[PDB]
Amino acid sequence: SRSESSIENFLCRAACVYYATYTNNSEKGYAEWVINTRQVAQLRRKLELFTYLRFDLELTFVITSAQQPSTATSVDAPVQTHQIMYVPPGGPVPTKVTDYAWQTSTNPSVFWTEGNAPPRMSIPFISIGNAYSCFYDGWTGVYGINTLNNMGTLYMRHVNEAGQGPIKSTVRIYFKPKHVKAWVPRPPRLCQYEKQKNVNFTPTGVTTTRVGITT
Amino acid sequence: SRSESSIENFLCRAACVYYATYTNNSEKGYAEWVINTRQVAQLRRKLELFTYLRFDLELTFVITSAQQPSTATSVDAPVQTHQIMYVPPGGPVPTKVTDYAWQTSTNPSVFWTEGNAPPRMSIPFISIGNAYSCFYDGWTGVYGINTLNNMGTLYMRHVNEAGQGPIKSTVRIYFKPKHVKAWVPRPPRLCQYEKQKNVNFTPTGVTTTRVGITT
Amino acid sequence: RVRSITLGNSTITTQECANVVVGYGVWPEYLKTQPDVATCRFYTLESVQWMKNSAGWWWKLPDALSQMGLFGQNMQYHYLGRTGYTIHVQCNASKFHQGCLLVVCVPEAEMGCSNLNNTPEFAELSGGDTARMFTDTQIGETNSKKVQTAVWNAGMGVGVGNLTIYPHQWINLRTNNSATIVMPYINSVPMDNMFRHNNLTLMIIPFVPLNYSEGSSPYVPITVTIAPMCAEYNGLRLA
Amino acid sequence: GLPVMTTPGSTQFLTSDDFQSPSAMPQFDVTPEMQIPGRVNNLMEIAEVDSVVPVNNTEANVNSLKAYQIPVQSNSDNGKQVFGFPLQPGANGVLNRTLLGEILNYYTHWSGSIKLTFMFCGSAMATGKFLLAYSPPGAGVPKNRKDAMLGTHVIWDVGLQSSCVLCVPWISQTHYRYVVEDEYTAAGYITCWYQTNIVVPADVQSSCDILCFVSACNDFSVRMLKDTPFIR
Amino acid sequence: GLPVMTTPGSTQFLTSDDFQSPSAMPQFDVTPEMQIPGRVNNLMEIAEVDSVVPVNNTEANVNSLKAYQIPVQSNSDNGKQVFGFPLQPGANGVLNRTLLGEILNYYTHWSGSIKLTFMFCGSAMATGKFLLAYSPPGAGVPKNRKDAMLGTHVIWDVGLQSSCVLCVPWISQTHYRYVVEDEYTAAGYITCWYQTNIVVPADVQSSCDILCFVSACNDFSVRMLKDTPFIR
Amino acid sequence: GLPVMTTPGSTQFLTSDDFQSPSAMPQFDVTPEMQIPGRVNNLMEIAEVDSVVPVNNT
């Protein structure tokens, strides 16, 4: 039963990659995440077993809210609706809760209200190249960036206006590669990751040590 | 109509095996249960009619919440979302509500929000052996443990942050063996169960007594 | 009529028309790595003396043959193994003796301890070739690591009269004096370590106590003969 | 989307429901099943196995092997009753904790016949005759060997046979299934009497013992699974 | 509308679910796939690639290339052990971080055989004999060349062959799959001994080095993906 | 999943509805039906039986 060691069964697992909070009375109460696979070390190491990858994206959002302190004699906030906007690479990006970018028709968005099943959206392989690259030995100049790996950005905000009390919401983004194809195996990462942007490392031993060659 | 005395109709019944509570303002407000069939005497006795068993697991969770005392002038908590994580044998285990184990991608988890149908998950036969053993005459040393019967652990916690008042939730776990196969019948347990971990017993009479052999 | 059965360099005699109980309708067979046929021989353990006050005897299977020739040698040599058994139980009694015995082979006969918090030690759970005896009294809780050997619970917290669910044969002295139980390999894994796990436990419990008149022999010997069947172990060479 | 309507009971959790459920560990791949001897497909296979009946309850005996021993000895006067118990498999006490009784106490309704086997465990030189009488429900228990003989009975000669097997008949209120537990209802009895004394030679013990075995004989069935009353 | 009923678990998010999801960018049209060399379909293809084993852990060596070098030199007395390590691919330390070990540490259960290759990297004029012994699980490690020879072994003549390949057998508790990690369990060892001294001509260095390679040989398999313990 | 739309009256309980319902006791097995004399299929069979008229109310 070698089926569980296939590329699909190895990489097609949902994982929480990003976590953020946003309140509804700040003008800045919006969460953003540039989609990248280097956020989580465990997922980064599993993807870096290969050089070139091609996969689809399935995103599931777990949004929960919590009541913040207020002075109102009575608070009776209705059900909250949230907007999750996906900005494709090169699309307009918001800087405030009230911004035109939130209404761009070419920026697909999901409107979801609390109490239902969590929202879910899928993004396909959107690179002008033929595959994503986990390693790039060259310059774009910055070494090893390869801007052909841009996957877009996600934005989240409250749709409802603020009522008689603030509401703070937290969003958990779940990331799942689908229909994955991998090329050019590479040695597993041995040194601890130091920076999210580069492969920099501090030299470490090859393995754990024993007392002598004869144990 | 001997159909109701078959193994499937005898064992395929949902039963509440575990019950626990967890609050959302304690750092320790999480419920855990190591999956074992020795928790309930009635189910233990029915399974111990046989020596070797093979079955799938169907789990249904009945989660309810209750408002705890607070001093806030007004409490308007939104709908609560709960996380139920299944940790396969050998997987990482949490010790706090905020712990990495809650985000392990290989630990399947269910995110469920109150007001909907109760969540349900199914675990297959996950033993390296060919069947579970209800009795083991040997050592692993501890007598009669047979670590090949590990079925994993379940963990439960609030996803929402604490609001203006504490919320205490209780979870009822419902356990149902599916597609059961049994081998080597054994005599029904006669002495009362004394310990959950072993078969220890205190000697008791063979049956109830009458006045004389001629009634 | 008497039938003589020779296995290896050992031979025993049985009544030709003796009834054999096959364990679960399955004869011992080979795993569908390394077999041994020099083990295919009868191992006659020491005879025990059935008396008036006898409560019963039991032997854990792998352990009983741990100090017997090549079978024990194979047990310490190989790490893993599997085997079936053929058990002969014979009583030597006259027609002036009366009594009834239950001869039962219990798979995975996990036994309780007198102290509810502990577990029995290996010495109390098995005596190897020596037999372990049940007790018509209840072992006190003060005892720390002994088996609760009350017969009516059979050391398993069950009704002793319900042991007939396991492969068994009755020995009624007025009718028959021998029992033959053929036990296949029964486990949750294809092979197991023979030194840390006793697959089978043979039990002999007198339901009707031995009785006789003055002048008759005050004992009835019980002889147990065990012949491993289709034994095989793990290989020890390279690929 | 496709128009749908939710009927009553849509989001409910009925503990006896049978619905497809999502697998928490898809792509796990389970250990293949092996052929283990002694596969059980029905509890009634356990119910049809003979087990020893503790006829001699006699609370001084329930904590010993004497509970299964029915004493038999040479008595001066003849016609005494050896033993007797009601034929209630699941409520009485003698058949409560046997293999048949344990299975029955997991259900509320049951049907079928009871197979009773009696084994004489005296010396091979002992001879005698026993009268095993079956009283149908409604009819009272016999008070004498004569009354037992006038009813349904079997004369058992231990000098010729060591075992006797009786299959008591179903006989129920055209109910097919009847309650495992019962309330002051016609029960039906089985009793044994000394037809003759036990004849023994010199140097042979006259006092012997009888063993009783029970099991389901004819088309036995159960219904309405429940909780066993023997657990706390 | 059509009557429907929602079963338990209808609005839940199970992280292992496999459901159709709406596409955020329908009508995008993806770049056609090209033929890139080195397509990988299974991690076991990586597991079957030979990699250098750091036999000489020797913490003064783990931060150098000496970790892979097994010293061999002309010793006055014969029969010393050259090296030895337990055959635990995923827990010990020598096979932990190899290509095979890294793949294994992503799973909880594994099955199959280990292929060990030893390469002599001395001069072409050096000659000698080495005894490579395999101890099955349960059996203790050899203490002498004689004890090693009496067990499973191969006599390796560096004067005739520069490499020797051993495929250690599976041998597990009829479990088919066994735990990648382990606890004080029978391990099985591989050890090397000086059958003869290293014979060398004039102007040739007697001190040499041996390289060890590991890989999966027979039908290797893994189960129950998990998190690797090597990341923080 | 498959796209669906809930029409008005989806979660309502109409006392005259005719919908499949879950069985609380699946695997029970009912007592087989016997032939009882006097089976009634319609109330009009009762309506066609002669009965005595209380003409003298009085």
Numbering used by the authors:
A (entry chain 1), B (entry chain 1): 58 to 197, 203 to 277
C (entry chain 2): 12 to 43, 54 to 260
D (entry chain 3), E (entry chain 3): 1 to 232
F (entry chain 3): 1 to 58
Publication text:
Mature CVB1 virions, like other enteroviruses, have 4 structural proteins termed viral protein 1–4 (VP1–4). They form an icosahedrally-symmetric capsid of about 30 nm in diameter with VP1 around the 5-fold, VP2 on the sides of the 2-fold and alternating VP2 and VP3 around 3-fold symmetry axes. At the base of VP1, there is a hydrophobic pocket which normally contains a lipid factor. Similar to empty particles, recombinantly produced Virus-Like Particles (VLPs) closely mimic the structure of infectious virions but lack genetic material.
These particle populations were termed compact and expanded, structurally corresponding to mature native CVB1 virions and CVB1 A-particles respectively. Particle distribution is 48–52% in favor of the expanded particles. There is no density corresponding to VP4 of VP0 in the expanded CVB1-VLPTween80 structure and no significant unmodeled density which would suggest a flexible region. Residues on the VP3 loop are rotated away from the pore on the side of the 2-fold, potentially not blocking the VP1 N-terminus exit from the capsid. Unmodelled density shown at threshold of 1.5 σ above mean on the sides of the 2-fold outside the capsid could be flexible VP1 N-terminus. At the current resolution, an ion coordinated between three D203 at the 3-fold can be observed in both expanded and compact forms. In the expanded CVB1-VLPsTween80, a forked density is present above cysteins which could be additional ion densities and in the compact CVB1-VLPTween80 two conformations of VP3 R232 are resolved. Here we observed two structural differences of CVB1-VLPsTween80 compared to native CVB1 which are the presence of a VP3 loop in the pore of the expanded CVB1-VLPsTween80 and an additional density in the interprotomer pocket of compact CVB1-VLPTween80.
